[PDB]
Assembly symmetry: D2
Homo-oligomer: 244 residues x 4
């Protein structure tokens, strides 16, 4: 049967029971990322420039290609075919524009840590760190619109908002930068920490409208595995950086 | 060598000599479309509802997928690789958002002529009319960024702006609609007549190819632009045959 | 419900009723192509070198990219997902190899009519003639495996076999070529006229994928895809003969 | 300038200096995979069924989609455009047919270790093991013909031939299976180990013909990074199975 949200957008209770189950099943994998030691050290301006460097260089591929993932998912949509598809169409068209200067913001954050655009092109980091980007590519290329959006717009942007909030929570990290260049350097983190917390809930609403209230157990497992894969690749990336 | 625009954006004289030559070479093919009898009849509210119906239904595939072409072209870009690529990246990201309600505007124009969304899905028109959309798909899928933009954002949107202006030029066509629904029905045409969009695309194409592109690339660019105009002309000829 | 062919491969009666209905519904569009004046003139070695030239140059894009259309279709398959998908997997992997020298054969046929490989690259022909290739591209890129194969492997290869047979039916066209270079020049036509199971295998794969009771909406897509391929062929022929 | 092979196909000395340099630079990464402890244990029929299970399930995605990677590469070719492109066109068309029963052979090997086709679909393994398949997808999708063949036909197949030979080298592993079903179970390994050791050399020749004798340092680095990434993801997969 068809899903239509009745309750408030940012309450798990407003979504179908299978979706609530998915949120609970994937919560430990999300926690591993959000509560990670790396972000706690970064927050407190105690994170080694060696780790910071690997983080900033390795993190670039997903940052650079985010709108390309979204553009690939948009090519899956058709007008007036399904209500979920029409929501996805509109939302992806709106949010591709939002990502406009995000790559430039990352380059600016990098510059504050003496990471050049040339460093971002060269990608002289452990291949392990590129796994998330390859996964984002494949899902947005070949998986269903719902599975693909669960993996990228829901899982990545959801976790990103939570850990960037952790990193900005004390103000210690920001105080470590010069007053004059602070705004420019902290821009990428401020956008993701001070951006509508509704964002992943909008994504989840679209996913549920696409799959409906009674999806197959096979589709449920595919959705659970896609979300978990994104969180797990994010955790493995963090673990690899902290190993240095 | 590298291209950098000096002169005003909407003057042919501001672009490399090969581009000016391309504009002159493709101008008769553009004229066949813009000066077409169909738009002159539509302008004067003298176009048969039979032709109008085929036009509205057949025209839907390019309208519906226009943002999908731009999305496909965006996937060809990478950050900080080339100045032309960085312009294309930004421009495509901005203009995908611009096409948000364009499909809804087309559905609204259709509704004024009793063409339903179901009619648009069914596509019970001559397959000839779908050729432009198939060309758009292929070029934006497999051709270089410059070539694909030359055929879509430059050729299609360029010609579209010119013929929609012709259609709106007298006010006769708008007066034919009911006062109550007039604004809603005329919206798609009004959005396209009211244009720097084709010129911005030329600038990107020129920054991508440079001042001295290969003769093979020049021919590919000329053929792509001509193919878009020619498919538009053949679409118009097919509609007027009914 | 699931489809399993019991009857002979090359009889319409061996397929589901909806498929038989599709064959009858698309037969007039196929006939326009196969029974076309161009092939009748070519068969009798009476076709103007001017038309022959446009034909050979314009026909190149679909010939050159036919295995690419298959390769794109193969990317839509997964192992052990569906019986129809497993048949498509195997069949496309086998038939991509079959198309190996087909482009070289076309270049050789072209040479006999003073059409160079440079001519094929330049594509100095009416843009109308490229419509089939653009359609093949889109359907093999974005349509479902069944719809895409119906438009390429079924409709194109099916019609191609029938009109190449018409062209070779008298022996007049072959006799027009020099004895010494005849075999090399006639190779592309020989490979499509003398080789007729390919479209049936494609029809079998399509019916196995969609089953015995496909939706009316899916049936209509299948019908439209097959008709579009035949109609673009017909328009290509009409454009050629106008010259 | 244009490359044309003069010397024997299976000698590094027959290829341009940059290609010889690439072979030497990627040899340690290839060695980590081929000389891996997992294959040595498997060869001697001493590998834990727990590890063997993860191996067989996790290895399935690249095996299942190998022909799809090649098919994607074939779509990048055009006839009579470049000599290297014409060689690639022919070679991919021939070798897609070769992969016909390879997935069925893997399913048969899996059956001998009580791994069902359902297990292969479910993929209830560590997400780390899927990284090679995601990389294979992305490269075959968005990288150049040369870079994607270097990563798949050259790197993956080249290493596969070498480690499958290691696994079959003693006969101990084969003797561990029942006489009656041995041929059916060992088929995937036997096909890869017995295959003309010249297949990656065929691929290396095409890559060299595509890029020429004087490719840019940027293209050389791209080729080196692609080959290394494939070997590294292979190594990480092996390390993950052996951890269990």
């Amino acid at each position: 049967d068809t899903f239509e949200r009745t309750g408030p957008l940012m309450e798990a209770s407003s979504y179908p029971a299978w979706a609530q189950q998915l949120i609970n099943d994937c919560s430990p994998a999300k926690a591993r990322v959000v509560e990670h030691e790396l972000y706690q050290q970064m927050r407190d301006a105690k994170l080694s420039p060696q780790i910071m460097r690997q983080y900033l260089i390795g993190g670039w591929p997903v940052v650079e290609q985010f709108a390309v993932y979204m553009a690939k998912n948009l090519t899956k949509t058709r007008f007036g075919r399904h209500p979920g598809e029409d929501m996805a169409r509109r939302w992806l068209m709106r949010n591709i524009r939002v990502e406009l200067n995000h790559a430039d913001y990352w380059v600016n954050w990098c510059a504050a840590h003496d990471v050049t655009l040339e460093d971002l092109h060269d990608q002289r980091v452990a291949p392990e760190l590129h796994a998330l980007s390859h996964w984002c590519w494949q899902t947005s290329s070949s998986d269903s619109l719902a599975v693909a959006m669960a993996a990228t717009n829901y899982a990545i942007e959801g976790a990103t908002g939570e850990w960037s909030a952790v990193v900005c929570s004390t103000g210690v990290y920001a105080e470590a930068f010069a007053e004059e260049t602070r705004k420019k350097s902290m821009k990428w983190l401020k956008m993701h920490a001070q951006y509508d917390d509704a964002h992943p809930w909008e994504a989840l609403e679209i996913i549920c409208t696409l799959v409906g209230n009674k999806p197959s157990l096979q589709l449920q497992a595919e959705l659970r595995q896609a979300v978990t894969k994104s969180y797990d690749y994010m955790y493995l990336f963090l673990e690899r950086c902290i190993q240095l």
